[PDB]
C-alpha cells in the first residue's frame, strides 16, 4: 500500500533549568525507528526498530552529527522567535518541526512535507510545490525571508524527491516482514446493561497494524455518527493498535445495530453484531 517517512523534532526552552532540550524521532508509517535526545547522558542516535540495526557506523555518526547540530541551531531559533514575538526571557517555549515524504502504492513520490509550529500553533510550512512558503504571521515572514536567502526550499525539495524516497524504500525493503505486513483487527461486540431498558454495545478492534481503521455503528442501516462514542486509537505496546466504538441502545433492539470494520489487513470488510 501507501507508505510514509516522517521526522518529528521538538525543541523546548526552559529558563533557569539549562539550555533548550532537543528531541528527534523518526517514523516509517506507524513504526518508530530512531530517536535522539539532547538530555541523554551521552546524546547519540539510537535504534528503535530491529530492521534499522543493520545500518553501519557511518549512518549512526552522520545522524548524530545532524541532530547535535540541530540541537544548537534550534536553541538559536528559539531565541530568535522569542524576539519576533517580543516575549520575555522568563517563559518556556516550543518549536516543533515535522517533515518527510509520502509514497503511493507503486512507490513513487506522492508529496513532500515540511511544517513548523511555535507553542502548538502553525508557524511556517513548505507548500506542496516544494518551492514556496506559507507564513502564519509577520514573525514567520522573517523566517521565510531567511530561508529564501539560504535556498532552504530548494535544499528540501532535493531531499524530499531524492534521499527521503531512497531511504524510505530501503527501510521498506529491510523491514518488509513488518512494515509491509498489515495485521487485521481481532473484532468482537460486548454488551453492558446500564439500566432496565438501555444497554451499551461496544465494538472492539484489537491487534491491528497500521493504525488507520474505520469503526462505525449503524441502526437499521443508518450511521449513528452522533450517538457513537469513539475513543482515540491507542498503542498496545507491541506495535499494534486498539480501538472501540460504543452506542447506548434500547433493550430488545440490539439486533437492529451493526458494527462495521474497515482495515487494510482484512480480506473483506467486517459486519458484526452482538452474539448473546
Amino acid at each position: 500500500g501507501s507508505h510514509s517517512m516522517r521526522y518529528f523534532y521538538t525543541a523546548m526552552s526552559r529558563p533557569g533549568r539549562g539550555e533548550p532540550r532537543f528531541i528527534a524521532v523518526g517514523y516509517v508509517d506507524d513504526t518508530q525507528f530512531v530517536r535522539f535526545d539532547s538530555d541523554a547522558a551521552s546524546p547519540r542516535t539510537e535504534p528503535r526498530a530491529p530492521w534499522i540495526e543493520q545500518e553501519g557506523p557511518e549512518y549512526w555518526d552522520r545522524n548524530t552529527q545532524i541532530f547535535k547540530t540541530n540541537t544548537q541551531t534550534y536553541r538559536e531559533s528559539l531565541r530568535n522567535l522569542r524576539g519576533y514575538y517580543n516575549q520575555s526571557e522568563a517563559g518556556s517555549h516550543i518549536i516543533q518541526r515535522m517533515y518527510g515524504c509520502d509514497l503511493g502504492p507503486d512507490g513513487r513520490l506522492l508529496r513532500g512535507h515540511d511544517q513548523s509550529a511555535y507553542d502548538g500553533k502553525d508557524y511556517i510550512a513548505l507548500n506542496e510545490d516544494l518551492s514556496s512558503w506559507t507564513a502564519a504571521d509577520t514573525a514567520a515572514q522573517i523566517t521565510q525571508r531567511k530561508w529564501e536567502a539560504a535556498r532552504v526550499a530548494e535544499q528540501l525539495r532535493a531531499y524530499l524527491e531524492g534521499l527521503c524516497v531512497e531511504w524510505l524504500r530501503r527501510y521498506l525493503e529491510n523491514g518488509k516482514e513488518t512494515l509491509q505486513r498489515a495485521d487485521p483487527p481481532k473484532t468482537h461486540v460486548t454488551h453492558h446493561p446500564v439500566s432496565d431498558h438501555e444497554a451499551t454495545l461496544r465494538c472492539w478492534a484489537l491487534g491491528f497494524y497500521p493504525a488507520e481503521i474505520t469503526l462505525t455503528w449503524q441502526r437499521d442501516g443508518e450511521d449513528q455518527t452522533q450517538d457513537t462514542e469513539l475513543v482515540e486509537t491507542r498503542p498496545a505496546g507491541d506495535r499494534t493498535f486498539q480501538k472501540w466504538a460504543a452506542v447506548v441502545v434500547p433493550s430488545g433492539e440490539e439486533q437492529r445495530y451493526t458494527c462495521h470494520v474497515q482495515h487494510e489487513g482484512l480480506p473483506k470488510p467486517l459486519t458484526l453484531r452482538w452474539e448473546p
Binding site: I66, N80, T143
Partner: peptide, 7 residues
C-alpha cells in the same frame, strides 16, 4: 535518514 538554517 534525516535531512542535513536558523528560524
Amino acid at each position: 535518514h534525516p535531512v542535513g538554517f536558523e528560524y
